[PDB]
Amino acid sequence: QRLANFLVHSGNNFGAILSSTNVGSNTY
Amino acid sequence: QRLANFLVHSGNNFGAILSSTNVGSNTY
Amino acid sequence: QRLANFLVHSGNNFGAILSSTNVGSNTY
Amino acid sequence: QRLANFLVHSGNNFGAILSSTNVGSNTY
Amino acid sequence: QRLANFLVHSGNNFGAILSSTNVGSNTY
Amino acid sequence: QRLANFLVHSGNNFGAILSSTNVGSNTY
Amino acid sequence: QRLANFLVHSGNNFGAILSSTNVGSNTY
Amino acid sequence: QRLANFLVHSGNNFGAILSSTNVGSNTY
Amino acid sequence: QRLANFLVHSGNNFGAILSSTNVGSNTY
Amino acid sequence: QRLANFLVHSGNNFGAILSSTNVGSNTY
């Protein structure tokens, strides 16, 4: 029913690849 | 029914590739 | 029903690859 | 019903690969 | 019902691979 | 320079009040 | 420079009040 | 420079009040 | 520079009050 | 520079108050 292929070539990663990230940084 | 192929070539990544990101940064 | 193939080639990783990250950094 | 294949080649890892991380860093 | 294969090749690991980590670092 | 006054009366709360929430719920 | 006053009256709380929450719930 | 006053009256708390919470719940 | 006053009245607490919590609940 | 006053009145506590908690509950 559902098929997904992921092929990634990374040299230098400082961020997010195939990832889920949550950051707050709130102020009261 | 559903087919998806992803091929990515990255040299230097400082952001998001195939990713989901949430940031708050709110102020009260 | 559901099939997913992941192939990743990383040289130097300072961030997230196939990961889920949560950070607070809130201030009261 | 559900099948997932993960193949990762890492050279130097300073972050997260196939991982879940939680950080607080909150201030009162 | 559910099948998952993980194959990882790491050279030098300073972070997390297939791991779950919790850090507090809070301040009152 | 900046002044804010918040006064809230809640009977029953199942959601968010003066809060910041992040949810992923992504699928690969 | 910045002044904030918070006054909250809660009867029954099942959610968040003056809080910051992060949830993943991702699937690979 | 920065002043904040918090006054909270809670009857029964099953969630979060003035708190920061992180949950993973990821699946591979 | 920074001043914060917290006054909380709780009857019955089953969750978090002025707290920081991390939970994994991940599955491989 | 930084001043914080905490005054808490608790009747019955089953959770966390001014605390930091880490739980794994992971499965492989």
Q: How many other CB atoms sit within 10 Å of the CB of residue H1?
A: 10
Method by which this entry was solved: cryo-EM
DSSP string, chain H: -EEEEEEEEEEEESSEES-EEEE---B-
Count of residues making up chain H: 28
| Mutation choice for C interface testing from H8, H20, H21, H23 by most C CBs within 10 A | H20
List CB contacts (< 8 A) between G20 and chain B. 24
Q: Dig out the tokens for D8 from the structure.
A: 């990762």
Q: Are J8 and J16 in contact (CB under 8 A)?
A: no
Residue of C18, C20, C23 with shortest CB distance to G24: C20
Produce one character per residue of B1-28: b if its CB has 16 or more CB atoms within 10 Å, e if not: eeeeeeeeebeebeebbebbbbebeeee
I26: closest CA among C22, D9, C6, C15?
C22
SS3 of residue G15 by DSSP: coil
Q: Dig out the tokens for F8 from the structure.
A: 């809230």
Cα separation of D3 and D21, whole Å? 24
Q: Dig out the tokens for A5 from the structure.
A: 């292929």
Q: Are F14 and H15 in contact (CB under 8 A)?
A: no
CA dihedral D15, C21, G25, I28 (to 10 degrees): 30
φ and ψ of B27, to 5 deg: -140, 135
Q: Quick one: resolution in A?
A: 2.2
F12: closest CA among C13, H14, B15?
H14
> Under an 8 Å CB criterion, which residues of C touch F?
4, 6, 20, 22
Neighbours of chain G (3+ CB pairs under 8 A): A, B, C, D, F, H
Q: Are H19 and D24 in contact (CB under 8 A)?
A: no
The partner residues of I16 in beta bridges, in order of sequence, read H16, J16
Print the SS3 string covering E1-28: CEEEEEEEEEEEECCEECCEEEECCCEC
Contacts of D20 (CB under 8 A, 6+ apart): C19, C20, C21, E19, E20, E21, G24, H24, H26, I24, I26
φ and ψ of F10, to 5 deg: -115, 135
Q: How many other CB atoms sit within 10 Å of the CB of residue G6?
A: 22
B22: closest CA among H19, C6, A19?
A19
A14: DSSP letter = S
SS3 of residue E17 by DSSP: strand
Cα separation of D20 and D12, whole Å? 19
Cα separation of H9 and H4, whole Å? 17
Count of residues making up chain E: 28
Q: Dig out the tokens for J14 from the structure.
A: 């089953």
